[PDB]
C-alpha cells in the first residue's frame, strides 16, 4: 500500500499546523485572519514547496495498445488475459499526449480529489448544520425580505454577470486573443449563475464574536444559506438547456420547460425533506425513545441520511432537500428529544461541519495541483472582477429600496454597505467549477473563480474590522401580524392551531 | 448514478428496523436478543428475500478480448482507444467462466464490500473506543492475570485447534471426500490463530445492565480487548511463514525469524502509539487550548488518526497501535482536557463505535451474497465445533489453576464457568476470513467460521441469563504492592514520581 496513507498524513499535518497557528493568532488577539484563510495559505505553501522540490526526474509514458474493432470506451469491461477474466474500470480519459513528457516530470503525488466528493460527503454535512443551527428568534420578522433577496438578487446578479462577460468576450473577439465561436451566451449565463453563491463564513464568525446587531446577522445568514441552493438549482437548470436544432439559439421554446423543470425540482426536494422531517417527528413523538439517547440519536442520523439518499436517488437535488429537512427537524423534532440527545446531535453535527469546511478550504488552497490550468488573459480576470462588484452593487440597493417602500416599520439603512462588503465566495462556486473539466472555456472560468476567491476571501477577512469600525455599526449588543403581509401571522396561527398539538407538546422529553 | 444510493438506502432501512425492533423488545423486557443478533437476523432475512425474488432473468456474459503480447495483468493500465488514453484499473479477477451463466442469473445487486473496509475504516473506531473506555478502577489488581490469559491462552487454543483440525483432515483423507495434498499444517495453524479472537459484546452489555461483580467484567473485557490484537498479529506472522525450499516443511529455521518479526511488530506498534499519546499530552499541557473546545477536540481526533496512519504506513499493524494510543491517551490526556471536551470526545467516539459495530454485524448477517460459498462437508463443521469447545476448555482451567497457585489473595473460583460460556466470535475472525478468497480451503474456513458465529452468537445470547441465574452469580452490586509481584507497585511509584508532575497536574483544565 502506502499511497493514501501519505496524503492523509500530509492533510492531518497541515490541519494540525493550521489549528496551532490559529490558536497562536487568537492568543495575541491579532485577528485579521480566519482559520479558513490559514488553511488556504498553508495549502498554497504546501503546493509551492511540493511542485519545486523534485522537479528533475524521469519521463513516464503510458503504453499504447491498438484495440481493433473498438469504436467506444465503456466505463466497465472484462478483459481476457491468460484465459482469465479481469474487471477493468475506465477511470479517466487523457487527451494530453503532447504534454505527456511534461506531465511525467515533477509528477510527485497527484493528491487529486474526485469532483463528486465535494457533493455527496462534504457539502451535505455543512448544509445540514447550517439548517439545524437556526436561532428561532427573529428570522421571521425579516423572512420575507430574506426571501426576496435570495430569490430575485441571485437571478439579477447572474443576468448582469452573464451580459457583462458576453460583452467582454465580444471585445476579446475584436482583440483576437483566441478563436471566436467557442464561447456562447449559455456559457456566460452558466458562469453568472455559478458566481452567485456567497459564503461569508469569516464575516459571520467575526459577527458572532463581536456580538453585532442580530438583525444584520440574521439577514446575512439567511441570504448566504438560501442563495447557495438557489444558485445550485439554477446552474443545473442552465446546464439542462439544450436546443434540438440551431445550438446556442435564443428563445428556442425551451425557456418554459427549463423553468418548469427548475420549479418541479425545487418543489420535489422541499416535499421530500418535509416528509422525512414529519416522519421522524411522528416516530419520536409516538414512541417512548427518550430513555435511550443512543437509539434516538442513531435513528435521527439515519433518517437524515436516508432523506438525503432518497432525494438523490429520485433524480432531484439532495442539498436543498437536506437543508429543508434540517430546518424542519430543528423546528419540530428538537422539542421532543431528551435533554441529552439535543446536545449530542448539536455537538456532533457542528464538529462534522467544522471538519468538513476545514478540509474543503485546505483542499481549495491547493492551486498548483491542477496541471491543465489556464491562468492567463488578464482582460478576462479584470472583466470578472468588475462584473462581480457591479452585480453585488445592483443586487442590494434596488431591492433594498423596493423593500423599504413597503417596509415593516424597520428601515435597514446603513446596513447595505456591510452587505456590499460581505461578498465572499465559498465552496459552492469552487465545486461547481471543478465539476466540469477538459474544456478550455471551463478551465478559464475555473481559474478565474479560483483567483477571485483567493483575492476576495483574504482581502475581506483582513478588512472586515476596519470596515465595521468605519460604519459606526453597533457592537457588543446582548442577544437576550398585519405588518408581516398578514400571511405569516396566518401561517403561525395555523401552526399553533393544528400541527403543534399533534406533532409535539406531548410525550416525555 | 443510482447504484450506491439504493444499497445505502437499504442499509439505512435495515438499521432503522433493527433499532425499532430492539426498542420494542426492550420495552417489554423480553431480552433474549441483542441489537447485534437483530441486525444479523435482519441481514439474513433481507438476503433470503433478495436471492429468491427475481431469480429468473437473462444471462449476461462478458466480452472476450485476445490481448496478444500480454503475459501479465497489471493493476493500472493506459489503453489507446480512438487515439485517446483511457486509464483502466484492474479491480478483480474472475476465474468462474464455467459458472458464469449461473452468475448472470439472479444477479440483482452485488452489495459486496471491499475486504479492507473492515480494516481501515470500521475496526479502528471500535478499537479506539474500547481502549479509551477504561474504568481506571480495578483492572490493575488483575492486570497480570489478564496478561497471562490473553497471551498464553491464545497460543494454546491456536495450537490445539490446529492439531485437531489437522487430525480431522487426515481422517478425511481416509474418507476421501476430496483430493489429499491441498491442505497443510500451515493452513490449520492459520485457522487456529484466526478462531481465537473473542468479542462477547452481548455478554458485556448484559453484565453492564445487570450490574454484575466488577472483577469478572474487568477480566472478560481485558481478555476480549487484548486477544483480538494478539490473534491479529499472530495470524499475520503465520501468513509470513514461507520456507525457501520444501514448502510446508517443519522447523525450517524460520521459526526464530517469525518470532522476531512478531516481537518487532508488537514493540514498534506500542512505541508509536505511546509516542503519539505523549506528544498530544504534552501539546495539551503546554498550551492553553482549554478555552476553545472545538480546537482541542479537532487536535485530539486528528492526532489519533495521524497515529493510526503513521503506524499503518511504517509497515506495522495499526489496530494494536490505535489500542495502545487510546489507552495511553485515556490515562494521561483525559486529566488535562476541559470539562466539555471530555464529554464531546467520549460521546462522539461511543456513537462512532455503536454505528460501526451495527454496520459490521448487519453486513455479517448477509450470508447469501457470496456466490463462491462452500457450505458442505459436515465433518469439517463438526470438527471445528468440537475444536473450539475443547480449546476454550483447555484455555481457562489450566491457566486459572496456575494463577491460583500464586494467587493475589483473591481466588476466582466459580467464575471460570462464565468464561467458558462466553465464547462468542466477533468481527476480527470474520474480517480475517474474508481477507483471503479465491481458494477452496480458504472458502471452507470462511464458511465454517460464518456458520460458527451464526450459531454461537444467537445461542449464547439466548442462554446468557439462565446460565447466570444457574451459577448463583451475584448481581445488582453497586460499583461505588508486594501481592502484585512488587513490579506493578514500582511502576505506579515511578509514574507518580516523575511522569505525572510533567505530563499533567498543571494547567487550566
Ligand atoms: C443529511 C445527513 C447528514 C449529512 C450526511 C452525513 C453522512 C456523511 O457525511 O458521511 C457519510 C459517510 C460515508 O458515506 P459517503 O462518503 O457519502 O458514500 C459515498 C457514496 O457511496 C458515493 O456514491 P454516490 O453518492 O451515490 O455517488 C461513492 O461514490 C463514494 O465512494 P468514494 O468515497 O470512494 O468516492 C462513497 O464514499 O458515512 C458515514 O459516515 C456513516 C456510515 C459509515 C459506515 C457505512 C459505510 C458504508
Ligand atoms: C484512531 C482514530 C479513530 C479511528 C479512525 C477515525 C477515522 C474514521 O474512522 O473515519 C475515517 C474517514 C474516512 O477515511 P477512510 O475511509 O478510512 O479512508 C480510506 C483510506 O484512504 C483507504 O486507503 P488505505 O487505508 O491506505 O488502504 C482507501 O482505500 C479508502 O477508499 P474506499 O472507502 O473507497 O475503499 C478510504 O475510504 O475520515 C473521516 O471521517 C474524517 C475525514 C473526512 C474528510 C476527509 C476525507 C479525505
Numbering used by the authors:
A (entry chain A), B (entry chain B): 17 to 496, 518 to 546
Authors' text:
Na+/H+ exchangers facilitate the exchange of monovalent cations (Na+/Li+/K+) and protons (H+) across membranes to regulate intracellular pH, sodium levels and cell volume. Here, we report cryo-EM structures of E. coli NhaA and E. caballus NHE9 in complex with cardiolipin and phosphatidylinositol-3,5-bisphosphate PI(3,5)P2 lipids binding at their respective dimer interfaces.
To improve the resolution of the NHE9* structure we substituted L139 and I444 residues to cysteines in an attempt to disulphide-trap the inward-facing state. We subsequently collected a larger data-set of 13,780 movies and the final 3D-reconstruction had 78,370 particles from which an EM map was reconstructed to 3.2 Å according to the gold-standard Fourier shell correlation (FSC) 0.143 criterion. The glycerol backbone and acyl chains of the PI(3,5)P2 lipid form hydrophobic stacking interactions to W321 (TM8, TM8’). Two glutamine residue Q17 (TM1, TM1’) and N136 (TM3, TM3’) are well positioned to hydrogen-bond with the C3-phosphate group. The position of these polar residues could partially explain the preference for PI(3,5)P2 lipids, since there are no polar residues close enough to interact with a phosphate group at the C4-OH position. Following a rigid-body fit of the TM2-TM3 β-hairpin loop domain in the NHE9*CC maps, the positively-charged loop domain residues K105, K105’ K107, K107’ were aligned to help neutralize the negatively-charge headgroups of PI(3,5)P2. In the improved NHE9*CC structure, we could model part of the C-terminal tail without protein complex partners. However, in the absence of a regulatory protein, the C-terminal interfacial helix in NHE9*CC is making a number of direct contacts with the linker helix TM7 through interaction with a lysine residue, likely restricting its mobility and that of the core transport domains.
